[PDB]
């Protein structure tokens, strides 16, 4: 499976799922300074949507 697809260039995850680990637990807004706390409500951005492009459309069509 893996490490054979990676050797040949066949489609495969960039990171091996078996050798993949979580990131434990991080600061939960009570052990954090004010400037590093997540806002309670999501903030409108105007950058909140992914930019459409040719690459996204062709990759999906090739995926089907």
């Amino acid at each position: 499976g893996f490490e054979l697809d990676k050797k040949l260039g066949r489609p495969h995850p960039f990171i091996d799922p078996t050798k993949k680990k979580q990131i434990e637990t991080t600061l939960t807004s009570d052990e954090s300074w004010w400037n590093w706390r997540k806002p309670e409500k999501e903030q409108w951005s105007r950058w909140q949507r992914r930019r459409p492009d040719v690459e996204t459309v062709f990759l999906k069509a090739m995926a089907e």
Binding site: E42, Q43, W44, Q48, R49
Partner: protein, 374 residues
């Protein structure tokens, strides 16, 4: 039966013809109509999101990705063909449209009298739009259609009112839902008691009702809510928010709405333009926060038909998302789609010309709302 499920719109097919007419206290120049656009971006409250004829809803529903059929009558003249060609171009089914070759479309014969020193008119012959008979109903449409939609304009015609309740009987027999979009015409604003008696029978037959904030307050008590909005505490505000002197978005309690509630009613929607959509179900109630921006395009903004786009957006999601009736979170997300449709509809001169497509509405919804509210 193909998908999406069919919807039927019942009433008169007209070009423009805003039915809801009241008195505004801020008139522009009587001749210079170039000033009149200033009333489009500072509108009367009853005209913030005006409704129109049922043919507007059918056209708007199709552009939003649904399928619709119009049930009504037109004359056999040239203007009747133009109205039918308008709906065929918009891919609205017209098998339910009947022709009256002996009548002139949108023409009413009336006689002028001078009773008690004042000029009045009385109807001599109703137009073909208000003369559809029960024997002329297309039962194939009423069998297939899942939502039956009509306005209160049909209650001003003795012929249509009798025909309306036969159409409702057939639709309920076939499992269709009844959508009452009030849109009170000019005569029905005269007095609360006469209007409530006139609409009570059709109100009780409806499963879904859409009314404006002005219509709802008029039907319950117009002066009580006007006094409520004008109240200002004498010494200090009851809370910090009351200090900001913001616009009033009062959410009516289900006990205030109780005189208008009945057993068969599944969803009541009260629209404050596109700014607020108050929704009421037997189990829950709430409000969807919306917005409007006609000042973004001051020279093409026109609010006419935006009420029809909101109603069409509601019916588009009700047919495809039946869980809106029972899930509050799902209902709020789907109603934001209707808000977006109303917003786009206000950016173009002309109701039909400006009705938005589904992808444009979906794009605006994702641009306006944060991703967690989609």
């Amino acid at each position: 039966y193909d998908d999406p499920p069919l919807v039927c719109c019942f009433g008169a097919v007209q070009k423009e013809f805003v039915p809801v007419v009241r008195v505004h206290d801020n008139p522009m120049h009587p001749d210079i109509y170039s000033q009149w656009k200033m009333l489009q971006w500072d509108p009367p409250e009853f005209g913030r999101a005006p409704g129109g004829p049922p043919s507007n809803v059918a056209i708007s529903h199709v552009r939003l990705g649904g399928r619709a059929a119009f049930m009504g009558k037109v004359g056999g003249d040239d203007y009747g063909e133009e109205l039918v060609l308008m709906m065929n171009k918009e891919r609205v089914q017209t098998r339910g449209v009947k022709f009256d070759e002996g009548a002139s479309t949108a023409c009413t014969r009336v006689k002028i009298k001078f009773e008690d020193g004042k000029m009045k008119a009385e109807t001599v012959k109703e137009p073909p739009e208000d003369s559809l008979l029960a024997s002329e109903l297309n039962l194939a449409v009423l069998k297939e259609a899942r939502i039956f939609h009509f306005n209160s304009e049909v209650l001003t015609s003795p012929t249509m009112e009798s025909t309306l309740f036969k159409a409702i009987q057939w639709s309920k027999k076939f499992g269709g839902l009844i959508f009452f979009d009030l849109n009170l015409p000019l005569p029905l604003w005269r007095s609360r008691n006469e209007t409530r008696k006139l609409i009570k029978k059709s109100w009780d037959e409806a499963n879904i009702i859409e009314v404006s904030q002005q219509e709802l307050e008029f039907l319950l008590d117009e002066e009580y809510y006007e006094r409520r909005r004008n109240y200002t505490p004498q010494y200090f505000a009851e809370d910090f928010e009351q200090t900001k002197n913001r616009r009033d978005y009062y959410h009516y309690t289900p006990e205030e709405i109780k005189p208008l509630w009945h057993d068969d009613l599944k969803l009541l929607v009260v629209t404050d333009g596109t700014l607020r959509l108050h929704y009421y179900t037997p189990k829950f109630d709430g409000v969807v926060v919306g917005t409007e921006d006609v000042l973004i395009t001051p020279f093409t903004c026109d609010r006419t038909g935006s009420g029809d786009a909101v109603v069409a957006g509601i019916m588009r999601k009700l047919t495809t998302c039946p869980e809106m009736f029972e899930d509050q979170d799902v209902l709020e997300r789907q109603l934001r789609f209707a808000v977006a449709a109303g917003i786009i509809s206000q950016w173009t001169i002309g109701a039909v010309r400006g009705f938005p497509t589904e992808s444009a509405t979906q794009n605006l919804k994702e641009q306006v709302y944060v991703p967690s509210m989609w």
